[PDB]
Every structure is written in structure tokens, then in C-alpha cells.
Structure 1
Amino acid sequence: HSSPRLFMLSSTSSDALRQTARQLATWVEEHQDCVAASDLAYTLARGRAHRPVRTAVVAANLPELVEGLREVADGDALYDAAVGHGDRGPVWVFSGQGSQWAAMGTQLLASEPVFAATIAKLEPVIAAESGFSVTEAITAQQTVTGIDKVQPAVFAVQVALAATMEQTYGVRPGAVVGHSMGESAAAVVAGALSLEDAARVICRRSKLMTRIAGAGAMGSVELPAKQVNSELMARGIDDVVVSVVASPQSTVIGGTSDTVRDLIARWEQRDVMAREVAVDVASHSPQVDPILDDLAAALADIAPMTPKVPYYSATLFDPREQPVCDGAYWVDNLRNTVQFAAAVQAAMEDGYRVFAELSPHPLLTHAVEQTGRSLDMSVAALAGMRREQPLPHGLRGLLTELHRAGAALDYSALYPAGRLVDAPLPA
């Protein structure tokens, strides 16, 4: 087929990668009439041991590839070395609310059949539970609004991104990490809950949250949580708590609207990077106390299962402990402080270095990097999607970035068959 292909090439330095690109362009130009584009793509991906400094060239024909390789060979770009050693899969990071955007699902519904099939599966469940079309919501001219619509819609995108990456691109995650509502998608991917039970969890939890919409406020501050807690106790504040611990230098507070606003005003004045976060309900604070008995009742039938993938819980007090995702877990999930930094840190201490955020737009990339920096580790924090990013080739770009970063993946998914070819082998 004269369709565009992904040609991988790697080396030990940026300059040696250019030398490899020039040698390959010269070879492809001399043997273009003898080599099939598909066989060369297969050989480069599955017949070569990928070295640390990686790149890939997209091309529909061999003369197009020679231009793309010569572009690399003649350039002056700095190619970052892979952070992972191809031994562990990526850690999927599922962030909370706030990533949603207008017609976020349109391009992936068209370019990714596994994304469309997962949305199709979810459609009747979300329709029965929350009373709306998740397909109309993720393809609308306006951004999804209302906690009862936002949470099911963002969850649906997260889960459909994970299924595409596993089924279509051969990317089995090494571990999962969720941040607040991101834990429903994390639990489906890890195998702790079925897609349907996890959709029931997000639909029911968001319907109950609409009863308390308006109660409380949240704020982000660039201070460590130990410090923030000291300030609250010192000031005599009992109605505002630490809601999220995202990074060793970043904290989210939550509680009554007035006190949160007062705290942000005085932190801003002291040149500390404070900011009220737009949220309908102040979660992970006593503001959610009224709906916790009702939530437990709604999730009484939810059937948890033993996670088949390492799940770094931000709800549990030990993130390395494996969750029992019953109704009690999801009530603690809503009320307890999101210990995201602790979970990311445990995954990094355990050896994971490639993190990819499967969400409509990246909310935690900066937090993952701050945890890596604090541990003096070189990590990769990738975004699956960005707001208004064109995706003509679906998630093939994320696949390239995962490969470039050194995440372990099954190369027989994107390059299923072909002939090994006598292309050059660099010394």
C-alpha cells in the first residue's frame, strides 16, 4: 500500500543518528526500485535493536523517505535519549476534571476504530445512568458542562484512549495511576472493575455531586503540603483542608468559598503562585460529607476484581497496596486527599520512567516532572492528547513518543508481517 508508514531509526548520539540517517538515505535511494516500503518499515522496527537516541520518519513512498531522512541528516536538532530501557511498559496517568474541550472526540471517533467501538459500548450505559448521549457530548460545538456530564464524558475519552493504545498499538501499560475521578478509568484498565461497573461508578458519583453543586471552592498553591497544613492550623482554619498533594512543591486546598478566597489572596500577595480553581464542588474536603452515605448505597452492587496490572493508588495510605475497588473505595476516593505525588513517587522508586497521560488535555505532566526532579531521576511525562490538536493519524504520534522515550511495547502490533531486508547496520 502507498499509505504513510512510520520508519524508525536510532543511534547512540544526535550526531551518530544523523550519520545513520545519511547512510540509510543513500541506501534507499540506490535500492528504491528493489525494496518494498512495507518490508523496510518492518525491518527497521522489528529487525533492529533500538538504540537510546531514537527518531522516526513518516513517508508514503521511498523517495519521500529519502527526503525525510536527508532532512534529519542535514539538520541540527537535539534528539533526547530514551529514558526507559524497553523493559517496562508505560505508566498510564488518568487525571481528573478540567481537561475537557469542544468536539474533543470527533477526530478520534473517525481515525480510531477501537476508540469508536469503546464509545459505542459506553453509550447505552451512560445513557441509562446519567440520561445523555456521551457521543453528542464529545462531538458538540460547545465544551461539555455540568459535573453530571463532564465526569462521564472525560472518563469515556480516557478509557477509549487506553483501549486504542492496547488493541491497536500493542501498548500494554506497565502500571496505572489515577488522580481523583481518573481512578475509575485507572480501575478499568488495571482490571479492578469492568468497563460497565466503572461507568456506573462515575455516573452515580457525578449525579450525587450535583446535589452539592456550589458548596465550597478549591485553590492551587505552589507550597509543599506539610507547609500548607502548618499555615491552616496556625491561622485557626478548620473549614479548609489539603485536598490534593500533586507534587512535592504543589498543593490543592479545598473547603468553604470565603476562607479559600482569603488564603489565595494572601498567598498571591507574598509572591507564592496561588489561584482559585474552577470547580462546582469542593471534593476531598468535608464539603462532600452529605452525599457519602448515598454514594455507598448506589455502589453496593459494584463487583471489584483483583487488579491484573500494578495500580498505584492515590486514595490508599500505601500506594503500593492493591485496591479492593468496592463502594467503600469510591467513597474514600471522593473524601480522602488525592495522594498523587506519593503514588507517582512509588512508581518511580519501583523503576518506571515513562508516564503518559491519557486525557483530553494534559493536567499532570508538570507534576510528574517535579516528582522525577525531586528524586534526581530522568523521566518522560507525555500527553496523549492536547486541546485542539489535529489527529489525522489517530494515536500514531503518541506511539512514536512512547517508542522515542524507551517504553516497552509490542512491535508486532504496528508492523505485523514483512520480509527482513539487507538494509545497513551501523557499527
Structure 2
Amino acid sequence: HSSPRLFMLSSTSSDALRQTARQLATWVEEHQDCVAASDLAYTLARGRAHRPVRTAVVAANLPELVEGLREVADGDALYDAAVGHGDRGPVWVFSGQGSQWAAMGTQLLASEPVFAATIAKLEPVIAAESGFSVTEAITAQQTVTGIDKVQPAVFAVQVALAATMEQTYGVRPGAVVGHSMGESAAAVVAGALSLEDAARVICRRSKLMTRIAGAGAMGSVELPAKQVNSELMARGIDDVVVSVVASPQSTVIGGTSDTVRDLIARWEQRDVMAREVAVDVAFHSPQVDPILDDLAAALADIAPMTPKVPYYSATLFDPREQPVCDGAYWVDNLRNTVQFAAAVQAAMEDGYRVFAELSPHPLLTHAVEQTGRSLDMSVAALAGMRREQPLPHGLRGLLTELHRAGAALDYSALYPAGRLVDAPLPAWG
């Protein structure tokens, strides 16, 4: 009962939120000997209709909360308004490779039991399929390397993050969007594949890709894909193609190593933001053609299911179409262009405004923001975790940011029981 709690506080403006903080601090200070911290936290979260401008104060005791509330009330912070209306859940974004960092899973294995349980389920599957310990990989002092180790390790973090958010924090996703290998975690979370079949997909596909390691390169350019394709055709280039369409202004090309690096050098000379992407294989190009028949054969036993959650496909030519996640889908997922911008745009057109990337480090937050900006919409693109970020209280911070942003969530998961206290009710203004 003397453990730190999250006290939610909301209003219609930053000034009104400070007035509510001051009014609450005066009340808590006067009634601290009568009110239990658990009851007041329960009342603020489940007994109040959350207003547009939100915040939360963390405190282990009522005098600590009066300090935090008075700190808010005295300050001059600008509290951003929620972009969601609490009607739709968050859209989980599952990015590709490149998010991995050394001992990325250590703090979450200790602080989040559902993260540890999910990693325990995957441990024997990844061991049987890829021949390594995923727990050793995500807790080692050196970052996981080798496509056959990276993909199962990043997928394992992605799925353990989503299970923790739903099981511990009562956050059911409104929709899922995957990018490249991110689609295996998107399929588990959407109910299209079982945890095990999705692990099999990511294990098998990464083992086959080791055969073509070193063949080709990739590059990111801040130009729309129609423009990039026009330039490739104009220059007579057939060895480099558009591999990813990330945003209405961003494109990833892939193909032979020299031509990709030549194009990046040329774009930078025209003051166009261009960067080589660190890759062993040039995916979503003809470089992956040799291993596609073997992949189809490896995934012939994978059992797809009808998605239970809206699944915005970056593989299909219509993201609103619901995937049949069979072996053919995973072959197309590796070979076809990642139509990530089209998938994000479809979700935004359908009303989703809160996006959270469940990955070891954010790779597609800027892409999501760029699509929102193009549609003239106010969206939130959150990061589930960041490289070397302390997580002493697990994912409680991400829950707070989802709440502040206006994502629909089950408040009875974080505040399961308590008493409605006669705490002040600020006027409607």
C-alpha cells in the first residue's frame, strides 16, 4: 500500500489543469489522514471522466502527491491535448530489423512478469527452430548480430511488449500495422497466426536469408516513391528498385551495393536528405528471389486464421484487405515493396489517431508523423521503448503516454478495486 501510484488529473487547458492540481492539493492536504492513497488513485482514474488536457503525478504517499500536484500548479508547462477520444484503442506499430540493442530485454524480464512469461513460451521454440537461446541473446552484454539471431530476438521483444500491454495494463489494440518482419508480431497480436507459428515464420525466413547475406544494399531518401521511380527509369537503372514506401515524403531503395551508394551520394549533392541503411541483404527487391521457393516450402505447414483485430497490411495492394497469413503471404511480405505509408494512411482515414511502436527502439515514429501531417491530422506516434532507456517501473510510462494521448484502455486493469472518494469535481469549464 506504500508503493508508488499513478494519480490521473485532467482538464480543458494547461491553466485549468494547474487550477485543478492546486484545488486537489489543498483537498489532499486537508484530508490526508482520512483518505487512502489507493482509493484516491482509483477515484481519479475510474471515477472521473478524462478531459482533453491530461497529466498524471506519481507518488508513494499523500504528502508526496501534494508536492507533485503543487509542482504542476506552480509551473508553466504546456500540456498537449489528447488526439484520441477514448473510443478507439492504440494502433500497435511493429517495425523491422535495426531496433536491437545490448541487453534490451534485461529490465523488462525483471520488471514485467508477462514479458518474462512470453519470452519463456518462445524460448524452446526459437531454440528448436534457430538453435540459440533468445533469453541469452536479449540479456547479453553485446547486441544480437546475424540475421538468423536478430529477427527472432526483435520479434520476441515485440510480442512480449504487446502481451504485457494487454495482460498487465488492459490496453487492447484498436488495430495493428507491421513493416517487413514486423508483420509476424502484427499477425500474432491480430490473431492471424499463433505465437508459435509466427515464431516459426520469423526463424525459418531468417535462416534462409543467411544464404544471401552480403548481396545488395539499401538507402533511405526523403523523396516520394513516384519521384524515386521516375529517376530510376530516367537513369536506365534496373538493378535498384523502391523497396519501402514509408511516408508520402520518404522512400527506401534496394538493389546492387554500388548503384545504391551512388544514388545516395547524388541525392545528398542536390541537398536531399539521403542515408545508407545497414543491411546484409537488399530485401523487397529481386535480390531475395533465389530463396523464395525454399521459403514457401518451409512455411507450407503454417496455419493462418482470420484476424480478430483490424490488420493494416503493408504487403497487400489494399491495406484494408484482411490477410491470409499463409506461406505465400510471407514470401510476398519479403519480396513485395513495404507499403507502410498506405497502411498508416488507411488506419488514419478510418479514424485511428494514437500509434505506439512496440519495438526495442523507434524506427517508424517519424514516418507515422509525416503521414498524419500530410492528411492534416493531429496524431500521436509513441515509442514503446528506447535504446538504453531505464525502465524501473516497466511499461507503466507507456501506459501513461497512451492515456495522455487519448487511447481507449481498460482502467480496471491498472486500478482493479477501491472506493469512490468525495474528491473535488472541477466545474465544467
Q: Same fold (TM over 0.5)?
A: yes
> Can you list the C-alpha shifts for 1:392-427, whole angstroms capped at 9, x where unaligned?
000000000000000000000000000000000000
1:270 Cα deviation after fit: 0.8
> Can you list the C-alpha shifts for 1:365-389, whole angstroms capped at 9, x where unaligned?
0000000000000000000000000
User: Using the alignment, how far apart are the partners of 1:269 and 1:8 within structure 2?
Assistant: 50
User: Using the alignment, how far apart are the partners of 1:268 and 1:373 within structure 2?
Assistant: 24
Give the SS at the match of 1:243.
Answer: strand
1:335 Cα deviation after fit: 0.0
User: Using the alignment, how far apart are the partners of 2:412 and 2:258 within structure 1?
Assistant: 56
1:261 Cα deviation after fit: 1.2
User: Using the alignment, how far apart are the partners of 1:272 and 1:314 within structure 2?
Assistant: 26
> Can you list the C-alpha shifts for 1:214-241, whole angstroms capped at 9, x where unaligned?
0000000010000000000000000100
CA RMSD of aligned residues (A): 0.3
1:18 Cα deviation after fit: 0.1
User: Using the alignment, how far apart are the partners of 1:262 and 1:2 within structure 2?
Assistant: 61
1:269 Cα deviation after fit: 0.8
Where in structure 2 are the equivalents of 1:167-206 lying within 5 Å? Answer: 167-206=167-206
User: Using the alignment, how far apart are the partners of 2:181 and 2:235 within structure 1?
Assistant: 31
> Can you list the C-alpha shifts for 1:95-124, whole angstroms capped at 9, x where unaligned?
000000000000000000000000000000
Q: Does 1:269 pair with 2:269? A: yes
Where in structure 2 are the equivalents of 1:24-63 lying within 5 Å? Answer: 24-63=24-63
1:181 Cα deviation after fit: 0.3
| Equivalent residue pairs, number | 427
1:262 Cα deviation after fit: 1.1
Give the SS at the match of 1:412.
Answer: helix
Task: Give the equivalent residue in structure 1 for 2:130.
Answer: 130
1:290 Cα deviation after fit: 0.3
> Can you list the C-alpha shifts for 1:232-262, whole angstroms capped at 9, x where unaligned?
0000000100000000000000001111111
User: Using the alignment, how far apart are the partners of 2:419 and 2:228 within structure 1?
Assistant: 60
User: Using the alignment, how far apart are the partners of 1:163 and 1:389 within structure 2?
Assistant: 20
User: Using the alignment, how far apart are the partners of 1:188 and 1:219 within structure 2?
Assistant: 29
User: Using the alignment, how far apart are the partners of 1:62 and 1:261 within structure 2?
Assistant: 59
User: Which stretch shows the higher mean deviation, 268-277 or 126-135?
Assistant: 268-277
Give the SS at the match of 1:246.
Answer: strand
User: Using the alignment, how far apart are the partners of 1:16 and 1:30 within structure 2?
Assistant: 21
Q: Does 1:11 pair with 2:11? A: yes
Moved beyond 4 Å, runs of 4+: none
1:134 Cα deviation after fit: 0.1
Give the SS at the match of 1:218.
Answer: strand
1:79 Cα deviation after fit: 0.0
> Can you list the C-alpha shifts for 1:72-92, whole angstroms capped at 9, x where unaligned?
000000000000000000000
1:206 Cα deviation after fit: 0.1
User: Using the alignment, how far apart are the partners of 2:223 and 2:339 within structure 1?
Assistant: 15
User: Using the alignment, how far apart are the partners of 1:352 and 1:135 within structure 2?
Assistant: 34
1:178 Cα deviation after fit: 0.1
User: Which stretch shows the higher mean deviation, 265-274 or 374-383?
Assistant: 265-274
> Can you list the C-alpha shifts for 1:281-311, whole angstroms capped at 9, x where unaligned?
0000000000000000000000000000000
Structure 2 segments unaligned to the other structure (5+ residues): none
User: Using the alignment, how far apart are the partners of 2:151 and 2:210 within structure 1?
Assistant: 11
1:265 Cα deviation after fit: 1.2
User: Using the alignment, how far apart are the partners of 2:377 and 2:405 within structure 1?
Assistant: 14
Give the SS at the match of 2:414.
Answer: coil
1:275 Cα deviation after fit: 1.2
User: Using the alignment, how far apart are the partners of 1:175 and 1:245 within structure 2?
Assistant: 20
1:24 Cα deviation after fit: 0.2
Q: Percent identity?
A: 100
Task: Give the equivalent residue in structure 1 for 2:423.
Answer: 423
User: Using the alignment, how far apart are the partners of 2:424 and 2:261 within structure 1?
Assistant: 64
Task: Give the equivalent residue in structure 2 for 1:392.
Answer: 392
User: Using the alignment, how far apart are the partners of 2:75 and 2:263 within structure 1?
Assistant: 50
User: Which stretch shows the higher mean deviation, 266-275 or 228-237?
Assistant: 266-275
User: Using the alignment, how far apart are the partners of 1:263 and 1:34 within structure 2?
Assistant: 69
Structure 1 segments unaligned to the other structure (5+ residues): none
1:61 Cα deviation after fit: 0.2
> Can you list the C-alpha shifts for 1:338-358, whole angstroms capped at 9, x where unaligned?
000000000000000000000
> Can you list the C-alpha shifts for 1:319-346, whole angstroms capped at 9, x where unaligned?
0000000000000000000000000000
User: Using the alignment, how far apart are the partners of 1:412 and 1:19 within structure 2?
Assistant: 27
Give the SS at the match of 2:411.
Answer: coil
User: Using the alignment, how far apart are the partners of 1:129 and 1:225 within structure 2?
Assistant: 37
Where in structure 2 are the equivalents of 1:226-305 lying within 5 Å? Answer: 226-305=226-305
Give the SS at the match of 2:100.
Answer: coil
User: Using the alignment, how far apart are the partners of 1:80 and 1:273 within structure 2?
Assistant: 29
User: Using the alignment, how far apart are the partners of 2:274 and 2:11 within structure 1?
Assistant: 44
User: Using the alignment, how far apart are the partners of 1:111 and 1:292 within structure 2?
Assistant: 40
Give the SS at the match of 1:219.
Answer: strand
Task: Give the equivalent residue in structure 1 for 2:69.
Answer: 69
Task: Give the equivalent residue in structure 1 for 2:309.
Answer: 309
Task: Give the equivalent residue in structure 1 for 2:101.
Answer: 101
> Can you list the C-alpha shifts for 1:159-200, whole angstroms capped at 9, x where unaligned?
000000000000000000000000000000000000000000
User: Using the alignment, how far apart are the partners of 2:394 and 2:310 within structure 1?
Assistant: 27
Where in structure 2 are the equivalents of 1:356-371 lying within 5 Å? Answer: 356-371=356-371
User: Using the alignment, how far apart are the partners of 2:43 and 2:261 within structure 1?
Assistant: 59
User: Using the alignment, how far apart are the partners of 2:45 and 2:297 within structure 1?
Assistant: 51
User: Using the alignment, how far apart are the partners of 1:296 and 1:134 within structure 2?
Assistant: 25
User: Using the alignment, how far apart are the partners of 2:110 and 2:262 within structure 1?
Assistant: 47
User: Using the alignment, how far apart are the partners of 1:402 and 1:5 within structure 2?
Assistant: 17
User: Using the alignment, how far apart are the partners of 1:114 and 1:320 within structure 2?
Assistant: 31
User: Using the alignment, how far apart are the partners of 2:271 and 2:376 within structure 1?
Assistant: 27
Give the SS at the match of 2:325.
Answer: coil
1:274 Cα deviation after fit: 0.8
